[PDB]
UniProtKB/Swiss-Prot annotation, chain A:
GO molecular function: small ribosomal subunit rRNA binding; structural constituent of ribosome
Organism encoding this protein: Escherichia coli (strain K12)
Domain of life, source organism: Bacteria
rRNA-binding keyword on record: yes
Gene: rpsK
Keywords: Methylation, Ribonucleoprotein, Ribosomal protein, RNA-binding, rRNA-binding
Statement: the UniProt record of this protein carries the keyword Cell cycle: no
Protein's UniProt name: Small ribosomal subunit protein uS11
Curated annotation (Swiss-Prot), chain B:
Role noted for this protein: Binds as a heterodimer with protein bS6 to the central domain of the 16S rRNA, where it helps stabilize the platform of the 30S subunit.
One GO cellular component term noted in the UniProt record for this chain: cytosol
Boundaries of the shown chain within the full protein: 20 to 74 of 75
Any one Gene Ontology BP term: translation
Keyword terms: Acetylation, Ribonucleoprotein, Ribosomal protein, RNA-binding, rRNA-binding
Assembly, per entry: Part of the 30S ribosomal subunit. Forms a tight heterodimer with protein bS6.
GO molecular function, one term: small ribosomal subunit rRNA binding
Family that this chain belongs to: Belongs to the bacterial ribosomal protein bS18 family.
Protein's organism: Escherichia coli (strain K12)
Cystine connections: none
Listed name of the protein: Small ribosomal subunit protein bS18
Swiss-Prot record, chain C:
GO biological process, one term: negative regulation of translation
Subunit structure: Part of the 30S ribosomal subunit. Contacts proteins S9 and S11. Cross-links to IF3 and the P and E site tRNAs.
Residues of the full protein shown: 3 to 152 of 179
Keywords annotated in UniProt: Ribonucleoprotein, Ribosomal protein, RNA-binding, rRNA-binding, tRNA-binding
Sample GO molecular function, one term: mRNA binding
GN (gene name): rpsG
Protein name: Small ribosomal subunit protein uS7
Superkingdom classification of source: Bacteria
UniProtKB/Swiss-Prot annotation, chain D:
Protein name: Small ribosomal subunit protein bS21
Signal peptide as annotated in the record: none
Cysteine disulfide links: none
Subunit comment: Part of the 30S ribosomal subunit. In stalled ribosomes contacts ribosome rescue factor SmrB.
Gene Ontology terms describing biological process: cytoplasmic translation; ribosomal small subunit assembly
Compositionally biased tracts (Basic residues): 43-51
Entry similarity comment: Belongs to the bacterial ribosomal protein bS21 family.
Record-level Gene Ontology MF annotations: rRNA binding; structural constituent of ribosome
Organism per entry: Escherichia coli (strain K12)
Biological role: Probbly involved in recognition of ribosome rescue factor SmrB in stalled/collided disomes; fusion of protein fragments to its N-terminus decreases ribosome rescue in the presence of SmrB.
Keywords, in A-Z order: Ribonucleoprotein, Ribosomal protein, RNA-binding, rRNA-binding
Cellular component GO terms held in the UniProt record: cytoplasm; cytosol; cytosolic small ribosomal subunit
Residues in coiled coil: none
Length: 117, 55, 150, 51
RNA sequence: AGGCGGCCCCCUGGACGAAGACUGACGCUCAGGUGCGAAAGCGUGGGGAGCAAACAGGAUUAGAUACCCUGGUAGUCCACGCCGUAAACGAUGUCGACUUGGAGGUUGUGCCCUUGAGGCGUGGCUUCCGGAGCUAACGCGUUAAGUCGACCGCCUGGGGA
C-alpha cells in the first residue's frame, strides 16, 4: 500500500539453481522469483541471463513499494552474484552492503562422507 | 603470552571473513600455529569472535 | 585444416561493373552453362525497372539490403552434449546471404520460364508480405537472442 | 589480503594469485619433500622479517 | 592394537632425561592363565531429527533388480551386555648389541668468549633421501630386510578346505 524505499534482498546462486527474494527490514517478503519460473531448467538455471530474467521479475514484484536503498544477503557458490546484483541495480536500487551467508558446511545433522566433483 | 584473550592480536591472524590464516603467510612454526588455532577457537567460547562471520 | 582460403577472387560483370552480379550468375547457373544465366540476369528484372525506388541500378541490391545479419545459430558438439551457439556472419557473407536464398527459391519453383520463376521471389524479397516466408530468417533472429551459458 | 572489502561490492574478484593452492599452501602435495629440502631456492624465510 | 578430536572442571594411566641416592642380578621371554573392537549383528530396555539397507512410487532402458528422485523400517545414538570380527594391512612377535652420511621438526638434559633477528653438545620421539651388506626383485638402510645371542608361535602346491 505505502512505499518504503528501503529493503533487504536474499539471493541464492548455485551451479544448478538461482533464487531471488526481496524482504523488508524485519524479514517480510515483498516479492519472489525463481529461474525455474522464469523458464530455465537444469544447469542452465545458474546462468547470467536466467538470473537476470528472475531478478528483473523480482524487482517488478516490488514495483508497488518504490525501492531505492538495498542491503543484500548472498548464498551459494555460483558466479551469477555480480550480474544478478547489476541486473537488480538496473531497477534503480543502490546496494550499500553485501554479506555472504552460504551454508558451506558448519552445519548440523549428519556429516556426508561421499566425494565431491 | 600475557593473557591470550587479546582480540586485537587475534584479529591480526584472521582474514576479513574471519578465517585462520595459513602458517606460510605469517611465517609461523607449527608448534605455535596449533596453539594460536586453539586460542582463536577458545576465543569463540569467550564470545570475543563469531564461529563464522556469516553469523 | 588452416593454410586455406579465405575467398578466391572473381571478375566483375563486364556490362554492369559489379562483383555481386558476377557471384549471382555463378550460383544461378546450372551444369556450368553460364551463357544461359547471362540471359536470365537482367531479363528477370523486366517487371522491377519502374518498381525500384532506388532506380534500376539498385533494383536487385535492394533484395540483398533487406537482410544483413551479424550472427547465425549453429548446433555444435561440446562432448556427450550438443548445444545451440551463435557464430559470426562476416562482411564477406553479410552481402551474399540473401542472394543464396533467392536462387534456391527460384530453383524450387515450377511455373513459367526461369526468368519468371526468379522474378516471383524477387518481387517480394524486400516486401516480405507472403505467409510463413520470414521463417527464412529464424536462423538469425534466434542468434541475436542466444543465451547459452554466459 | 585478497577480498578485504566489506560493505559495498561489484564485479567478480574471486580469481587471485598467492596463498590457497600453490604459492605456498595446498596443491602440489605429490612433490612432498620439495616443500622442505630445496631450502633457499623455494624458501625465503629465515627470520629478521615476517618470521 | 582398534583407535581417540569438539568448550570447562575434578579425578587419572603410561612415556622421557642429567648429576647423585638405594636394593645388590631383584632381570628377559613365556605353553596355559588374566586382560582390550574400527564396524556390522544379536540380547535386556530406550530413542527416531539426520541418513538409510529392505519395500513402494516415478523415470532412464532391451530389461534397470543400479545411478537419478519422492518416501521409509532395521541400524546408527544411549544404560549397557555378548562376541572377539577386518585390508585388526604403515604386512615389521618380545628382549639384547655393533655400524655411515644429509635435509627437517619436536621434547628432555647440559653447555655457549651467545655482538645471532640465537648457536652447539647429548638422550627419547621422528619424516624423507642416501653408503655398506642382504634379498629373485621392490627395496631394507642405525627406528634395518645388514650383523648376531635369549624365549614363544607359524611354513613345506593349487582345485577340494
Amino acid at each position: 500500500r505505502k512505499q518504503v524505499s528501503d529493503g533487504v534482498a536474499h539471493i541464492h546462486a548455485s551451479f544448478n539453481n538461482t533464487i531471488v527474494t526481496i524482504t523488508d527490514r524485519q524479514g517480510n517478503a515483498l516479492g519472489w522469483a525463481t529461474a525455474g519460473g522464469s523458464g530455465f531448467r537444469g544447469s542452465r538455471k545458474s546462468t547470467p541471463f536466467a538470473a537476470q530474467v528472475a531478478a528483473e521479475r523480482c524487482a517488478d514484484a516490488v514495483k508497488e513499494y518504490g525501492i531505492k536503498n538495498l542491503e543484500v544477503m548472498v548464498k551459494g557458490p555460483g558466479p551469477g552474484r555480480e550480474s544478478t546484483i547489476r541486473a537488480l541495480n538496473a531497477a534503480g536500487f543502490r546496494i550499500t552492503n553485501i554479506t555472504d551467508v552460504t551454508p558451506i558446511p558448519h552445519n548440523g545433522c549428519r556429516p556426508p562422507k561421499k566425494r565431491r566433483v | 603470552e600475557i593473557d591470550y584473550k587479546d582480540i586485537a592480536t587475534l584479529k591480526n591472524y584472521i582474514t576479513e571473513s574471519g578465517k585462520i590464516v595459513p602458517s606460510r603467510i605469517t611465517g609461523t612454526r607449527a608448534k605455535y600455529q596449533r596453539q594460536l588455532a586453539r586460542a582463536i577457537k577458545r576465543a569463540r567460547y569467550l564470545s570475543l569472535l563469531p564461529y563464522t562471520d556469516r553469523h | 585444416r588452416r593454410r586455406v582460403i579465405g575467398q578466391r577472387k572473381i571478375l566483375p560483370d563486364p556490362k554492369f561493373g559489379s562483383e555481386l552480379l558476377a557471384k549471382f550468375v555463378n550460383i544461378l547457373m546450372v551444369d556450368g552453362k553460364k551463357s544461359t544465366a547471362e540471359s536470365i540476369v537482367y531479363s528477370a528484372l523486366e517487371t522491377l525497372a519502374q518498381r525500384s525506388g532506388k532506380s534500376e541500378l539498385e533494383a536487385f541490391e535492394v533484395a540483398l539490403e533487406n537482410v544483413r545479419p551479424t550472427v547465425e545459430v549453429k548446433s555444435r558438439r561440446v562432448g556427450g552434449s550438443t548445444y545451440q551457439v551463435p557464430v559470426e556472419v562476416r562482411p564477406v557473407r553479410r552481402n551474399a546471404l540473401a542472394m543464396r536464398w533467392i536462387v534456391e527459391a527460384a530453383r524450387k519453383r515450377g511455373d513459367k520460364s526461369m526468368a519468371l520463376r526468379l522474378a516471383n521471389e524477387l518481387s517480394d524479397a524486400a516486401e516480405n508480405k507472403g505467409t510463413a516466408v520470414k521463417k527464412r530468417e529464424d536462423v538469425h533472429r534466434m542468434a541475436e537472442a542466444n543465451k547459452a551459458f554466459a | 589480503i585478497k577480498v578485504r572489502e566489506n560493505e559495498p561490492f561489484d564485479v567478480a574478484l574471486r580469481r587471485f594469485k598467492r596463498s590457497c593452492e600453490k604459492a605456498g599452501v595446498l596443491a602440489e602435495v605429490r612433490r612432498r619433500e620439495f616443500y622442505e629440502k630445496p631450502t633457499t631456492e623455494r624458501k625465503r624465510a629465515k627470520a629478521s622479517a615476517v618470521k
